[PDB]
């Protein structure tokens, strides 16, 4: 890597280790990682979510819990970590609980599993919201692989998952999550 600029001066490099940065701290900091083009991951506390985007409406407004205010998420889960991570994520992406359309989560009394779903579709009357969300995802995920095409249906679902031990550690994502998370 190094080379000589003159005969007395030298070009040199230094690289930081993210393994040491995220291993030698006792603070539970949120991890945001991009495994591939279709699967994103976010860990916080004892909660860990796989985030995916596709046209499947896993939840429907008629049968599942409508979330309009963070407190409403009390019915989504029995683990406070999952509720807190979901609220923090929706805050970081830029969801306005006052003027933006409500989103959906599965009632905790049902046994399919925890999950929440945001429309995100870049079409029709949603196109503004879908843009903002996209922008948020570009801030939270470096090199964010946008999978939601224009004029198409593209619902996002976040569900529990075991953290991929092979996912790259990117601290820029954590920094953006901590900074944007303020409200």
């Amino acid at each position: 890597e190094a080379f000589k600029i003159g005969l007395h001066t030298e070009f040199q490099t230094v690289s930081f280790s993210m393994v040491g940065l995220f291993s030698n701290n006792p603070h539970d900091c949120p991890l945001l990682c991009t495994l591939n083009k279709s699967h994103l991951y976010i860990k916080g506390g004892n909660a860990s979510f796989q985030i995916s985007f596709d046209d499947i409406a896993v939840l429907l407004p008629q049968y599942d819990v409508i979330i309009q205010h963070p407190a409403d998420m009390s019915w989504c889960s029995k683990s406070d970590d999952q509720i807190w991570l979901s609220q923090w994520f929706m805050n970081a992406v830029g969801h306005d609980w006052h003027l933006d359309p409500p989103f959906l989560c599965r009632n905790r009394t049902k046994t399919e599993g925890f999950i929440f779903q945001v429309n995100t579709s870049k079409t029709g009357v949603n196109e503004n919201y879908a843009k903002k969300f996209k922008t948020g995802m570009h801030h939270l995920y470096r090199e964010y692989p946008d999978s939601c095409l224009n004029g198409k249906l593209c619902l996002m679902k976040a569900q529990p998952t075991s953290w991929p031990l092979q996912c790259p550690l990117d601290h820029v994502n954590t920094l953006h999550f901590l900074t944007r998370g303020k409200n």
Partner: antibody
Amino acid sequence: QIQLVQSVETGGGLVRPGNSLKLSCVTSGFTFSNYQMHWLRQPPGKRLEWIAVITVKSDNYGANYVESVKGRFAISRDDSKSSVYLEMNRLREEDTATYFCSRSGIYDGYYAYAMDYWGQGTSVTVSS
Amino acid sequence: SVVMTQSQKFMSTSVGDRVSITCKASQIVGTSVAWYQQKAGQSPKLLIYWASTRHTGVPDRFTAGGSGTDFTLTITNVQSEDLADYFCQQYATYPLTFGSGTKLELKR
């Protein structure tokens, strides 16, 4: 081989109105503790009816029932024996049907209650 | 409760034809629909899930479609082994409900 075999724990499938009856269903070929298990029934002439579901240890072995069996039926599971059980109390003549145990998995990357494996069926007749 | 309506109790066909069994939900269930096959009241067989995705091991003669309330299972190039009962199911809400059924019989 994925295998789900049902059985009647005590006695036969013919019971009188008012008695109890415990169906069992033993499995092999998959990690039983990772999958959610359902009990259903098919009455003669009538359509298939969902009865109960029980989930895994991560969700505290939670259970859900249809309204008509709530308080009478109880779904349980023994992960060490890879078995799911349905205890039916205060049996009525309307409970006469072919009962099935079933497994639900993950589909297109999302957990749903489509049944990918079923038991062979246990005929239960409640009559005086 | 959601009512899954299969108005055709019986449907005749010949080996090689194309057959289409319909199902109509009393409520909007999106694509949370599965299609099952059953013979002689034995253990059912999962054929379709998420309204349009074929289960592994099912021949490619079976396709399916629909979104909302109207769902259709289609069997192209029907075989003798395909003569059975077919029914839909919704899993969008509790209780899970199934269709009345449609028996596929042989044209004669």
